[PDB]
Design a protein around this ligand. Structure first.
Ligand SMILES: O=c1cnn([C@@H]2O[C@H](COP(=O)(O)O)[C@@H](O)[C@H]2O)c(=O)[nH]1
Ligand SMILES: O=c1cnn([C@@H]2O[C@H](COP(=O)(O)O)[C@@H](O)[C@H]2O)c(=O)[nH]1
Lengths: 219, 220
C-alpha cells in the first residue's frame, strides 16, 4: 500500500512552472506525494513530472480523469507513465472496458490506477452520485485497489469505504476550499488531497503545517 | 452559423509521434480542414503541437480533451487549451451542469467553442453513460450548448440525440470505420464524421480519406 507522508497529498494546480516549483518546495518537508493535473501539465508540459521527481523525489499521481474509449485510454496511460507518473486517476463512469484498458498499461509499466467513483463538486449529484456505488462495485470486480471519493460528502465517502473494504487504498479531494474537513475525511480515507487551501495561502508552509496540526492524532 | 467542415470529415489525429502525425495530416490536407487532436498526441508532444499544426496546415483544431473535472479545474483546462490555439474543446456532460457551465463561460470570454459529449461509442458506454445520455443532451440544450458529440456505432442513439438538440445544433460523430460505424449512415444525423485509424493507419492515408469521401459524395 502507498505510504503517503502525513496522509497529505498536495494538489499542485498552479499553472506557472516557477510558482509551482517554489510553492511545492516551500511545503516539501510536509509531503512526499504530489498530485499533478492538466492545469499544470497543459501549461508547462509533461516534462514537469520528471522535474518534480528530480527536485523533490516525491511520488506523482497524474490526475487526468481518464474518460475515453479503451483504445485511447491505453495511449493516454502509456504517455502518462512514460512521463514518470507513478499512478493515474481514471473515471469509472465510461464503463469497465475503459477502466480495464488503464489497468493493463499500469500493470505493464509498474504503476497504479486510482478509480474515481463519486466527485466532490455539486454537479456530481446530477449523474455521478447515482452511479457511484455501482462504479465502486465494478472496481472491486476488476481488482482495482485504489479509489478516489468526495471529502464534501462524508456519508458518501464512508459508503465508498464500506464497498471497497478496509484493505483498499482511498484518497479524497474537496478538503478546505470545497468545504471538506481534514480530520473527518481521514475517518474514511487513507489520505486527503489539498490544493488551494495550501497553494493559494499567504503562507503555504504555515497552511500545510496547520492542516497537519489539526490531524496530528490521526498520524 | 457553425464551423464549415470540409467534406464533412474530421481527422482524429491520435498518432503519438510528431513526425508521423505531421506527415499523415499533411497527406490528407486537400480533403480535410478540421483536425481533432487529443491527449495521445498532446501528452506525447506538448501543447505546442497545436501551434505546429496551425503553422503547417490550414486546419481548425478541436481539442478532444473530454474535460471531466470540477468547475474550477475545468476553467483552467479550457483556458490553457484555448491559449494554445484550439478553436474548440470537447467536454463531458456526465459530471453535471456546473462543470459544463464552467467550460462555456471560458469559451465565451475567450471567443472559442465547447462541444458537449453526450453518449460514447464504445461498448462500456452502455453501463452508465447511455442511461444518462438523453438528460445530458437536454441539459446541454438548456445551458445553451450549440455543438455536440454522439456515437456513430449506435444509429438509433445518434438519431435521438439529433432530435433532442434540434436541427440548428452542430453534431459530430466518432466511431466511424475502426469501431464499426458507417460514414453515410452516420451523416444522416451528424453534420460531420470523425475518422481516426481508418485513415491514419492506412498505407495511403490520402487514398483512405478520398475513398471515404467518394462513398459519401452524394451527401456533400
Ligand atoms: O471529485 C473530485 C476529483 N478531483 N478533484 C481535484 O482535486 C483537486 C482539489 O483541489 P482544491 O483542494 O484546491 O479544491 C483539484 O485538482 C480537483 O481537480 C476534486 O476536487 N474533486
Ligand atoms: O465517444 C467517443 C468519443 N470520442 N472518441 C474519439 O474519437 C476517435 C476515434 O478514433 P477511431 O476512428 O480510430 O476509432 C478517438 O480519438 C477517440 O478517443 C470516440 O471514439 N468515441
Amino acid at each position: 500500500v502507498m505510504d503517503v507522508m502525513n496522509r497529505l497529498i498536495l494538489a499542485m494546480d498552479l499553472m506557472n512552472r516557477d510558482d509551482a516549483l517554489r510553492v511545492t518546495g516551500e511545503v516539501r518537508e510536509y509531503i512526499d506525494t504530489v498530485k499533478i493535473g492538466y492545469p499544470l501539465v497543459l501549461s508547462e508540459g509533461m516534462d514537469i513530472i520528471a522535474e518534480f521527481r528530480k527536485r523533490f523525489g516525491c511520488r506523482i499521481i497524474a490526475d487526468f480523469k481518464v474518460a475515453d474509449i479503451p483504445e485511447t485510454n491505453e495511449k493516454i496511460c502509456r504517455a502518462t507513465f512514460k512521463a514518470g507518473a507513478d499512478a493515474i486517476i481514471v473515471h469509472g463512469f465510461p464503463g469497465a472496458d475503459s477502466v480495464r484498458a488503464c489497468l493493463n498499461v499500469a500493470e505493464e509499466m509498474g504503476r497504479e490506477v486510482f478509480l474515481l467513483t463519486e466527485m466532490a463538486h455539486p454537479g456530481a449529484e446530477m449523474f455521478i452520485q447515482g452511479a457511484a456505488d455501482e462504479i465502486a462495485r465494478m472496481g472491486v470486480d476488476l481488482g482495482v485497489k485504489n479509489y478516489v471519493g468526495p471529502s464534501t460528502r462524508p456519508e458518501r465517502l464512508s459508503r465508498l469505504r464500506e464497498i471497497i473494504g478496509q484493505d483498499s487504498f482511498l484518497i479524497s479531494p474537496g478538503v478546505g476550499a470545497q468545504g471538506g474537513d481534514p480530520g473527518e475525511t481521514l475517518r474514511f480515507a487513507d489520505a486527503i488531497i489539498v490544493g488551494r487551501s495550501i497553494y493559494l495561502a499567504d503562507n503555504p508552509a504555515a497552511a500545510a503545517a496547520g492542516i497537519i496540526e489539526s490531524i496530528k492524532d490521526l498520524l
